[PDB]
Amino acid sequence: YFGKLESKLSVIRNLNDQVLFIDQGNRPLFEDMTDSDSRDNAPRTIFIISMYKDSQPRGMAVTISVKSEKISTLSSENKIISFKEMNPPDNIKDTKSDIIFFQRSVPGHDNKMQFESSSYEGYFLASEKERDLFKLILKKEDELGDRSIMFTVQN
Amino acid sequence: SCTSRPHITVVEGEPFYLKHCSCTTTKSWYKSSGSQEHVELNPRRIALHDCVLEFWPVELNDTGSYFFQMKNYTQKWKLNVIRRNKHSCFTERQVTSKIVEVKKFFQITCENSYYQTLVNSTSLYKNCKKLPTIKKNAEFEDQGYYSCVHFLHHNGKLFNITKTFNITIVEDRSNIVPVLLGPKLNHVAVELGKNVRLNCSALLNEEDVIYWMFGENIHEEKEMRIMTPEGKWHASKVLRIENIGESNLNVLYNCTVASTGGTDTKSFILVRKAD
Numbered sequence A: 001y002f003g004k005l006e007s008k009l010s011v012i013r014n015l016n017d018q019v020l021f022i023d024q025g026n027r028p029l030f031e032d033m034t035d036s037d038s039r040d041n042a043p044r045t046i047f048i049i050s051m052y053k054d055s056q057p058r059g060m061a062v063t064i065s066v067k068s069e070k071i072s073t074l075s076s077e078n079k080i081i082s083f084k085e086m087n088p089p090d091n092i093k094d095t096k097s098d099i100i101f102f103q104r105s106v107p108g109h110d111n112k113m114q115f116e117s118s119s120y121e122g123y124f125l126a127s128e129k130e131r132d133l134f135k136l137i138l139k140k141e142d143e144l145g146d147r148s149i150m151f152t153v154q155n
Numbered sequence B: 001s002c003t004s005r006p007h008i009t010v011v012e013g014e015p016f017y018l019k020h021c022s023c024t025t026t027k028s029w030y031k032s033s034g035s036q037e038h039v040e041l042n043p044r045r046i047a048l049h050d051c052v053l054e055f056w057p058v059e060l061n062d063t064g065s066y067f068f069q070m071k072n073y074t075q076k077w078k079l080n081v082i083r084r085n086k087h088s089c090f091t092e093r094q095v096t097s098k099i100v101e102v103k104k105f106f107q108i109t110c111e112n113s114y115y116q117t118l119v120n121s122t123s124l125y126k127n128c129k130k131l132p133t134i135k136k137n138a139e140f141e142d143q144g145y146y147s148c149v150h151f152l153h154h155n156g157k158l159f160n161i162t163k164t165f166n167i168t169i170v171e172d173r174s175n176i177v178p179v180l181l182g183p184k185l186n187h188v189a190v191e192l193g194k195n196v197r198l199n200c201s202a203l204l205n206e207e208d209v210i211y212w213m214f215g216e217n218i219h220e221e222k223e224m225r226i227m228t229p230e231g232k233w234h235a236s237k238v239l240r241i242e243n244i245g246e247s248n249l250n251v252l253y254n255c256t257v258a259s260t261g262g263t264d265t266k267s268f269i270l271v272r273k274a275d
């Protein structure tokens, strides 16, 4: 069992202080933004982080949502990052879910967070450059202390 | 790189570009304003080349939405140009915030991987006073606006490009690994007609969370938080089970504290009386 508890609004950033947002195509991407850019690209810059209770607690269990035109929840299904249009549910009757992630702060830096996928043990939300884009993807860990799977969570 | 976000705010008087993230083929740039549907851009201060749209410099003239098309590709930008503070070195909307903990690694570095080959000079300001890098461990008084400025050569006159960081120096929290207080396994005595109230208690952080886990009417909850004389948050929560049947008997009721920094959980089993 996973069950919903409270929510916070947040602005997510990567190792370069690039801001997470959802693009016209519903793709989570990263880009430099001034505070005025982060403010005026809302609601696509404002992520809902919802917390869940867990029967087998592995960290802080969470879902991640944005409100584009409708609400969309981040999924790890088939080892791929994507936005599914659904509301974070009151509860989830499984041990691993494509939409649950475990948030853990990074020892020595409380501002930094890693998000481990619950459906795939060992895999983490990450920032990758793909061609001219910067993308939020799922990846198994490369180096040890890999800065690309660490994020800051502000308002 | 390239410019992927739908909306963009820049300051008047400054060089600026728009790069469409797809890179002798057919390109087309278009502009919308109030009464201008899609004015195809064909400029004879604006330059169109190699899959980018340049402003030299950008102006209030230019606020409006922009569209790009390369056959199977299309893109849209709302461009909002803002007034520049002419009395100062930066303008308050164009600022990027940064949070850096007091006694900790802190850097600021002026760079541009686009306009770098045109740069002739690059000066760094602190609250508009000249000072290219600042490498340092943080002091409270490093709070301020650091402005990076870049002075550019372009076909007869001078341009500057300026980025500013609002640095806030933050105190560090005293963050605690949450602990539960008491035995990890617990046996509690009760009688079938009647009720039990299980108290669960923990040392945790402001942001931390304490909850019960049963199967999911004869159950209920509610929470309390008091500060210890050592400054820590003491939290507790009671789970009430009213008309106990045997269904309530050998099942583990887990209370948990869950933090971004760690977790602890403890189980309660309900027993009749004989032990």
Ligand SMILES: *[C@@H]1O[C@H](CO)[C@@H](O)[C@H](O)[C@H]1NC(C)=O
Residues within 6 Å of the ligand: B013, B014, B084, B086, B089, B149, B159, B160
């Ligand atoms: C360029 O910066 C100089 C010195 O920082 C300042 O005097 C001037 O207003 C800036 N130029 C423009 C066009 O903003």
Ligand SMILES: *[C@@H]1O[C@H](CO)[C@@H](O)[C@H](O)[C@H]1NC(C)=O
Residues within 6 Å of the ligand: A035, B092, B093, B095, B166, B168
């Ligand atoms: C800089 O930081 C202060 C303190 O948080 C804040 O009140 C101010 O609005 C910030 N400046 C800008 C331009 O955002």
Ligand SMILES: *[C@@H]1O[C@H](CO)[C@@H](O)[C@H](O)[C@H]1NC(C)=O
Residues within 6 Å of the ligand: B199, B200, B201, B236, B237, B238
């Ligand atoms: C639960 O335990 C805490 C810590 O022992 C105590 O301060 C509090 O009074 C108890 N709460 C209730 C409702 O009995």
Ligand SMILES: *[C@@H]1O[C@H](CO)[C@@H](O)[C@H](O)[C@H]1NC(C)=O
Residues within 6 Å of the ligand: A055, B213, B214, B251, B252, B253, B254, B267
């Ligand atoms: C937590 O409780 C569940 C159901 O109440 C139980 O099955 C489980 O084994 C408990 N967890 C641990 C680690 O003892």
